Design an enzyme around this catalytic site. Structure first.
Site, PDB file in Angstrom:
ATOM      1  CG  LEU A  25     134.597  17.363  -1.808  1.00 52.01           C
ATOM      2  CD1 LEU A  25     135.154  16.100  -0.996  1.00 52.01           C
ATOM      3  CD2 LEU A  25     135.569  18.668  -1.922  1.00 52.01           C
ATOM      4  N   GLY A  26     132.642  15.881  -6.045  1.00 55.58           N
ATOM      5  CA  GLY A  26     132.629  14.933  -7.063  1.00 55.58           C
ATOM      6  C   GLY A  26     131.402  14.566  -7.257  1.00 55.58           C
ATOM      7  CB  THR A  29     126.635  14.070  -5.992  1.00 61.35           C
ATOM      8  OG1 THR A  29     127.231  15.509  -5.611  1.00 61.35           O
ATOM      9  CG2 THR A  29     125.162  13.922  -5.215  1.00 61.35           C
ATOM     10  CE  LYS A  49     128.634   6.695  -1.739  1.00 60.33           C
ATOM     11  NZ  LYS A  49     129.925   5.774  -2.168  1.00 60.33           N
ATOM     12  CG  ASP A 145     138.757  -1.981  -5.767  1.00 66.80           C
ATOM     13  OD1 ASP A 145     139.527  -1.872  -6.818  1.00 66.80           O
ATOM     14  OD2 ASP A 145     137.889  -0.927  -5.844  1.00 66.80           O
TER      15      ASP A 145
HETATM   16  N1  LIG Z   1     136.046  11.102   3.108  1.00 67.78           N
HETATM   17  C1  LIG Z   1     136.429  11.580   1.920  1.00 67.78           C
HETATM   18  N2  LIG Z   1     136.953  12.864   2.009  1.00 67.78           N
HETATM   19  C2  LIG Z   1     137.463  13.390   0.823  1.00 67.78           C
HETATM   20  N3  LIG Z   1     137.167  12.837  -0.321  1.00 67.78           N
HETATM   21  C3  LIG Z   1     136.704  11.999  -0.657  1.00 67.78           C
HETATM   22  C4  LIG Z   1     136.288  11.057   0.476  1.00 67.78           C
HETATM   23  N4  LIG Z   1     135.453   9.932   0.094  1.00 67.78           N
HETATM   24  C5  LIG Z   1     135.453  10.043  -1.110  1.00 67.78           C
HETATM   25  N5  LIG Z   1     136.095  10.916  -1.655  1.00 67.78           N
HETATM   26  C6  LIG Z   1     136.485  11.306  -3.100  1.00 67.78           C
HETATM   27  O1  LIG Z   1     135.271  11.638  -3.696  1.00 67.78           O
HETATM   28  C7  LIG Z   1     134.990  10.834  -4.763  1.00 67.78           C
HETATM   29  C8  LIG Z   1     133.885   9.695  -4.447  1.00 67.78           C
HETATM   30  O2  LIG Z   1     134.638   8.594  -4.583  1.00 67.78           O
HETATM   31  P1  LIG Z   1     133.822   6.964  -4.226  1.00 67.78           P
HETATM   32  O3  LIG Z   1     132.543   7.716  -3.789  1.00 67.78           O
HETATM   33  O4  LIG Z   1     134.586   6.233  -3.560  1.00 67.78           O
HETATM   34  O5  LIG Z   1     133.472   6.457  -5.637  1.00 67.78           O
HETATM   35  P2  LIG Z   1     134.585   5.429  -6.262  1.00 67.78           P
HETATM   36  O6  LIG Z   1     134.257   5.268  -7.731  1.00 67.78           O
HETATM   37  O7  LIG Z   1     134.179   3.952  -5.646  1.00 67.78           O
HETATM   38  N6  LIG Z   1     136.178   5.830  -6.145  1.00 67.78           N
HETATM   39  P3  LIG Z   1     137.238   4.797  -5.620  1.00 67.78           P
HETATM   40  O8  LIG Z   1     137.129   4.400  -4.128  1.00 67.78           O
HETATM   41  O9  LIG Z   1     138.596   5.427  -5.810  1.00 67.78           O
HETATM   42  O10 LIG Z   1     137.304   3.760  -6.341  1.00 67.78           O
HETATM   43  C9  LIG Z   1     136.227  10.393  -5.191  1.00 67.78           C
HETATM   44  O11 LIG Z   1     136.755  11.361  -5.925  1.00 67.78           O
HETATM   45  C10 LIG Z   1     136.960  10.141  -3.806  1.00 67.78           C
HETATM   46  O12 LIG Z   1     138.377  10.347  -3.921  1.00 67.78           O
END
Ligand SMILES: Nc1ncnc2c1ncn2[C@@H]1O[C@H](COP(=O)(O)OP(=O)(O)NP(=O)(O)O)[C@@H](O)[C@H]1O
Ligand SMILES: [Mg+2]
Length: 307
Positions: A25-26, A29, A49, A145
């Site tokens: 998803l991102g 990771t 994650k 935040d």
């Molecule tokens: N439970 C979840 N379900 C779906 N997508 C998620 C979930 N948690 C995080 N994401 C997405 O996966 C990515 C990881 O984000 P994250 O691990 O929170 O890093 P970040 O830099 O702190 N982003 P942010 O919280 O928006 O400031 C981001 O694109 C999130 O929107």
């Protein structure tokens, strides 16, 4: 028993054998997958994650401090409008397992669906985010935040605050400038009222379908802009009723700003008659399965029904 109360949240350790990553998803990771608690006959959609292994030991402990701090926070909170941690897993790299929010963050959602978000959705989101922040305030939590990118979308009808890396107890002690209260920027002061300011900016993000606040303005100036009394402009779809609530969130005297429980009341009032408060062309005509590649979804349960 010398002031605070013991935090008895449960921290669940999961086995790798218990969850199947399905898709990335991102990239910290993040995978979409399923968690199948041993011997429970359920499949729970999850985000997993997997932390970055990190080169420098300083970078290693930065990754790990964010991870354990936000695992601690998400394990300690329980509210329909905040993200819950389902568990962690201590493989070679640590993994954090959260409830899957299938539709991503809310900023990307309003950017991608501008022409199908009606006033009822917008105002209901505002109410749900204020409920989440009011719960955090009930727990003495200051988020620091809050932004549209830190609100996730379970369904179009149901969102949840996330990203507790910067959170802290209200009284305790030890950077997105365009979401920060003035006293946050000048004096590093953070309260529930500074969160209220950030909530105002977030609502403005929503009402503008994802515009960037103070676009093209360098962060060094924001502080002088705000001391001069300038604020974010009235969004096109906003009646003066909505905009005025938002403007009140940005008053310099933090005790004059509205409280989250007031914001719940006021936006609920407005969501009772959505089209009297936001004006969206074609409002009335706006509408919004196997997310995995799995053919057997029969036993799938949402985390919110398993808990
Ligand atoms: N439970 C979840 N379900 C779906 N997508 C998620 C979930 N948690 C995080 N994401 C997405 O996966 C990515 C990881 O984000 P994250 O691990 O929170 O890093 P970040 O830099 O702190 N982003 P942010 O919280 O928006 O400031 C981001 O694109 C999130 O929107
Ligand atoms: Mg974080």
């Amino acid at each position: 028993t010398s002031g605070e109360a013991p935090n008895q949240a449960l921290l669940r350790i999961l086995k790798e054998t218990e969850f199947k990553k399905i898709k990335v998803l991102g990239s910290g990771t993040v995978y979409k997958g399923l968690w199948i608690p041993e011997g429970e006959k359920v499949k729970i959609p999850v985000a997993i994650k997997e932390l970055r292994e990190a080169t420098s030991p300083k970078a290693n402990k930065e990754i790990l401090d964010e991870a354990f701090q936000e695992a601690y926070v998400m394990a300690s909170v329980d509210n329909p409008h905040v993200c819950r941690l389902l568990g962690i897993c201590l493989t070679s790299t640590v993994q954090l397992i959260t409830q899957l929010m299938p539709f991503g963050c809310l900023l990307d959602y309003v950017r991608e669906h501008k022409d199908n978000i009606g006033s009822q959705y917008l105002l209901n989101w505002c109410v749900q985010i204020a409920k989440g922040m009011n719960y955090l305030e009930d727990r003495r939590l200051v988020h620091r935040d809050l932004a549209a990118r830190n609100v996730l979308v379970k369904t179009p009808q149901h969102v949840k605050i996330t990203d507790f890396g910067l959170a802290k107890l209200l009284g305790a002690e030890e950077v997105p400038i365009k979401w920060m209260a003035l006293e946050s920027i000048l004096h590093r002061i953070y309260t529930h009222q500074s969160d209220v300011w950030s909530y105002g900016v977030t609502v403005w993000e929503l009402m503008t379908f994802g515009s960037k606040p103070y676009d093209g303005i360098p962060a060094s100036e924001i502080s002088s802009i705000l001391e001069k009394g300038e604020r974010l402009p009235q969004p096109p779809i906003c009646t003066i009723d909505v905009y005025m609530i938002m403007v009140k969130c940005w008053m310099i005297d933090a005790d004059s700003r509205p409280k989250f429980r007031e914001l719940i009341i006021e936006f609920s009032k407005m969501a009772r008659d959505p089209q009297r408060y936001l004006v969206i062309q074609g409002d009335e005509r706006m509408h919004l399965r196997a997310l995995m590649d799995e053919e057997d979804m029969d036993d799938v349960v949402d985390a919110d029904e398993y808990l």
